[PDB]
Amino acid sequence: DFKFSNLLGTVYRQGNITFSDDGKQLLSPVGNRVSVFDLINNKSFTFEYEHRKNIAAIDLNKQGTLLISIDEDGRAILVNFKARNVLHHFNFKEKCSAVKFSPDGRLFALASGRFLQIWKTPDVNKDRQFAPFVRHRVHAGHFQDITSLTWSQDSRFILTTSKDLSAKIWSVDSEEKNLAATTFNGHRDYVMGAFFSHDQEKIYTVSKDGAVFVWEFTSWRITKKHFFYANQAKVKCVTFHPATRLLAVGFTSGEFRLYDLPDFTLIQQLSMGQNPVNTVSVNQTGEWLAFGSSKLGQLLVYEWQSESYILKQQGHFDSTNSLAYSPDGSRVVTASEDGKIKVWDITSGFCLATFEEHTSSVTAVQFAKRGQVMFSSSLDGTVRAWDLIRYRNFRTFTGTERIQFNCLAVDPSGEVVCAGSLDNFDIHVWSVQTGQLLDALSGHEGPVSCLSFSQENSVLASASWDKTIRIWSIFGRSQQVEPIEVYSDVLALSMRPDGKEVAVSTLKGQISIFNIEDAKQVGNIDCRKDIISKFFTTIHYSFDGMAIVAGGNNNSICLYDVPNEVLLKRFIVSRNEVRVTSVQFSPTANAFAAASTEGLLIYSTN
């Protein structure tokens, strides 16, 4: 069946980002889920699983098989990275700032408050554990919160940094030395990073005030001191890549910097925005610098030798009204209250374009199928045709007066486009080509609020405040000149593709189906499932007319069997008001897309 697969409009929220071990993919906490970006192919996806709250910390083990993520309350989900299934939950009972697997993947380490926890794979001797990792030791030493962790390449040692202005180094395999083996004093401000150098004979400590200390064995003594002298900015994050000797630093201003150690040579000095750099990652070759800022919330992948950006996105924050799939199913396009229209590439997850001609809320968008032509309707009140190959607005249809448009229907062929208004009881009709006004469809006696064509030429259903469905043919003879009486009110109407039936969603929790030849109700579904009086405001038939997908101002999205009038699957939108305003199958119904308050949601099957 269908599973959550993409979260569009959001690339980074909070927490740490991390490259895969080969340096080719980037993981990004995207709220309470984790996204993965394929940087060499421009694909991304989002994991199905959700945390109870926002993610605070993640790590992918070296062997590329185990993903662990931790929400703000210290509730951790461990995931089979390659099969995408959840393997386990941990409760660490405390806020964790950082988690990191040991290089050999046998261990992982936690920063929970002031403590360093070490977790291990169960010994076959103790022989009766049902968890992939048991806790092996808690290490108590710091006076305040551990800030970051760094493993020693041999996996036997770890560095912690803290707000207590020290770093410490722990022996974390040999049983049992529970106490830090060396403490590193003392910076003025919080120690942000502490790193072994590639040869393991130098340690670097970096601190919020802006200091780097070099430490060598002689006991460990400070050997040199360096300073960023960045003004009105503190170190907000830092990482180090030992083999290429690269230190990447992100500041509370938009600024980030690249150095090498131990020379402390300034290689790069740039900005990413005007907001804090919350997380930084250097990929395996050193060639690629990743940055996350929360406020906006940006994600950057930067190839610094060539001064070019591999990836550069921020979060989107529109209120979406309508969404429409392109016929190939490659893209979905969304309509926004501010009046913007956006084009999204399903496979990359990114926004290809942004039109802004509409000077008022875009109420609907719909594809002429084929080709790359998309129509939009607006309160402003115009209908606009859009070319998606050249990304422009060639035609613009209006009425002989300034009337808002609320709904939109594009004859699939598409000879003609039509739109309903609140400012009258007629359906307005334009020849696409001419592209002038045609004789309206006038018989409704309430404002028309829903429109829907079939695929099989060329039945037009409409729905009105008058609480009736009418059936039209723009040019030929209708298939039902008689009205249909719904008791009511109709929030959404989807015409079955064949054109022999129609479905509507009512103000009661009813999806009801009507035969058009008989103008009588053939099926009613009582929609009762809404993890929230209760209804649906958007429905859509699948291509073969066997399924309806539905959402409304609640937290459930429902997938109904239409013949058997049952529920196939319910999708709880969010696990922490939630609204879904537009819902639609992809052309081959291999997926469906939902415009929610939690962003653009894609559910898929494979």
Author numbering: 4 to 221, 247 to 560, 577 to 620, 678 to 707
Text lifted from the article:
In these yeast cells, around 50 AFs and several snoRNAs, such as U3, U14 and snR30, associate co-transcriptionally with the 35S pre-RNA to form the first pre-ribosomal particle known as 90S or the SSU-processome. The UTP-B complex consists of Utp6p, Utp12p/Dip2p, Utp13p, Utp18p, Utp21p, and Pwp2p/Utp1p5. Pwp2p is a protein subunit of UTP-B and essential for the stable assembly of a large set of proteins forming the SSU-processome. We report the structure of the N-terminal domain of Pwp2p, which exhibits a prototypical tandem WD40 repeat (tWD).
The WD-repeat-containing region of Pwp2p (residues 1–716) was subcloned, produced and purified as described in the Methods section. The purified protein was crystallized, and X-ray diffraction data were collected up to 2.54 Å resolution. Over the 716 residues of the construct, the final model comprises 608 residues (from residue 4 to 707). Pwp2p (1–716) contains two canonical WD40 domains, WD1 and WD2. Each WD domain is a seven-bladed β-propeller composed of four anti-parallel β-strands. The first WD-repeat domain (WD1) is composed of residues 12–343. The second WD-repeat domain (WD2) is composed of residues 4–11 and 344–706. The connection between the two WD domains is ensured by residues 12–14 and 342–346 in addition to the external β-strands of blade 1 of each WD domain, and the loop connecting blade 1 and blade 2. The two WD domains form an angle of approximately 30°. Several patches of conserved residues were identified, some of which were spanning an extended area over WD1 and WD2.
